[PDB]
Amino acid sequence: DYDELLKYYELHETIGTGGAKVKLACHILTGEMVAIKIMDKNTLDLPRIKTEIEALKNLRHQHICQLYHVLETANKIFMVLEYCPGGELFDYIISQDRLSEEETRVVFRQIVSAVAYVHSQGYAHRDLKPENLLFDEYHKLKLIDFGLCAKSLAYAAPELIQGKLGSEADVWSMGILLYVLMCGFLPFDDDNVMALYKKIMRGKYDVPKWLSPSSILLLQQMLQVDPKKRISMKNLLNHPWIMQDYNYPVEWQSKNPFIHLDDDCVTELSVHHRNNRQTMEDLISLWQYDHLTATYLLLLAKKARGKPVRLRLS
Ligand SMILES: Cc1nc(Nc2n[nH]c3c2CN(C(=O)N[C@H](CN(C)C)c2ccccc2)C3(C)C)c2sccc2n1
Numbered sequence: 001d002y003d004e005l006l007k008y009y010e011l012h013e014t015i016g017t018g019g020a021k022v023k024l025a026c027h028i029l030t031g032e033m034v035a036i037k038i039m040d041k042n043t044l045d046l047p048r049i050k051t052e053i054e055a056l057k058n059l060r061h062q063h064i065c066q067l068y069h070v071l072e073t074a075n076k077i078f079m080v081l082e083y084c085p086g087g088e089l090f091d092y093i094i095s096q097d098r099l100s101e102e103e104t105r106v107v108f109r110q111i112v113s114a115v116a117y118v119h120s121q122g123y124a125h126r127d128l129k130p131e132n133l134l135f136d137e138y139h140k141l142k143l144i145d146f147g148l149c150a151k152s153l154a155y156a157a158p159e160l161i162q163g164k165l166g167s168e169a170d171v172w173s174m175g176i177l178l179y180v181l182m183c184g185f186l187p188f189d190d191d192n193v194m195a196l197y198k199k200i201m202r203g204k205y206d207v208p209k210w211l212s213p214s215s216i217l218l219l220q221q222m223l224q225v226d227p228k229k230r231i232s233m234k235n236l237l238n239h240p241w242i243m244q245d246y247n248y249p250v251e252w253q254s255k256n257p258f259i260h261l262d263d264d265c266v267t268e269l270s271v272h273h274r275n276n277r278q279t280m281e282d283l284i285s286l287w288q289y290d291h292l293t294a295t296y297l298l299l300l301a302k303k304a305r306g307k308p309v310r311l312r313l314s
Helices: 046-058 089-096 101-120 158-162 166-183 193-202 213-222 263-273 277-284 291-304
Strands: 009-017 021-027 032-040 067-072 076-082 133-135 141-143
Touching (some): 046 067, 089 133, 158 166, 166 213
Antiparallel strands (some): 021 032
């Protein structure tokens, strides 16, 4: 089962195991580290993986953890993704107790950027929480886990739980997230699942003394039980709180394109393929998420880190 995969990657330690597992690995042609999520097809739950793949094939963003390569044997599925060394936002909050307003703003703008983009493309994430945000090599946030996306109860909006409106529910989840960043605990919690549900429907929460009046006001706009009264994604982008100490709205548009190609990465792939430029371009622009896609995108990442755009051809 690991046979096709080992043509392309050096497998290292397994660094996470859940109900899928995650293996660290090196991509041989570029020497870049990657993180391969591995699913068994017999013990699976399945169309959750299919949703995620098709979402990550169509989404590409500076704050979305990038998919490079999809492989499938008769009993396994491999998703080769960006390696984020910094770990989960959840763990970071635990280590810090809570973030100050300033640092919360820094991280939160990155969350809003990703979710605004996901929404611009016609998806809702639907499982936004700090476990699904990872710090990359530059301590920048990356959104993961698009399995429940569409065209955790503590983070679910009241209307989503009542089963009735996807863009608004993400704003609620972001509101819960915002609270957890600045407080270190959830605004609605209970051991009993139905009592928690009840608390969420009421929409009443403790407001700690250390929150600034601006924070409080924004939380209140985000955590409106009625989604019609809830602040929209658009108005969140240039909200006074979000703008404080930046003075410009969240830059949400993608800087990682499908249409434009990097000339140096194309040149290097051309020599490997003994290809003409125009035909190497057409081949890359099919975006099949095969080894070409992976090698092209990992060369770009190499370039972005100030390393030479070079394949290791042995
Ligand atoms: C496991 C782990 N991953 C790390 N970095 C990562 N880089 N790239 C990725 C991760 C984690 N990823 C991931 O899909 N995790 C899922 C999260 N699901 C449950 C919401 C997961 C975690 C554990 C077991 C199965 C699946 C991707 C994006 C591949 C890092 S950094 C320091 C520790 C560490 N531990």
